Design a protein around this ligand. Structure first.
Ligand SMILES: [Zn+2]
Ligand SMILES: [Zn+2]
Length: 76
């Protein structure tokens, strides 16, 4: 099962996920691929910012769904 994650630069990465993966889990897969710490990541789906403890299934995120990755300003 695959989802796409688009960054502000237009670049897209593909993650292998499961319906019961938490948002925490997705951030960890993004850290593995891109080396960005989870606390710097905000994930958005359907215009809504996803919360760490909820699952992809909670949010009706399906195969081939696209999430948007917004980075926190390092140092705020
Ligand atoms: Zn998983
Ligand atoms: Zn398809």
């Amino acid at each position: 099962m695959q989802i796409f994650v688009k960054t502000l630069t237009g670049k897209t990465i593909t993650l292998e996920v499961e319906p019961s993966d938490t948002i925490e889990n997705v951030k960890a897969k993004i850290q593995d691929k891109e080396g960005i710490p989870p606390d710097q990541q905000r994930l958005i789906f359907a215009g809504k910012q996803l919360e760490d403890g909820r699952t992809l299934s909670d949010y009706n995120i399906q195969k081939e769904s696209t999430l948007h990755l917004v980075l926190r300003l390092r140092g705020g």
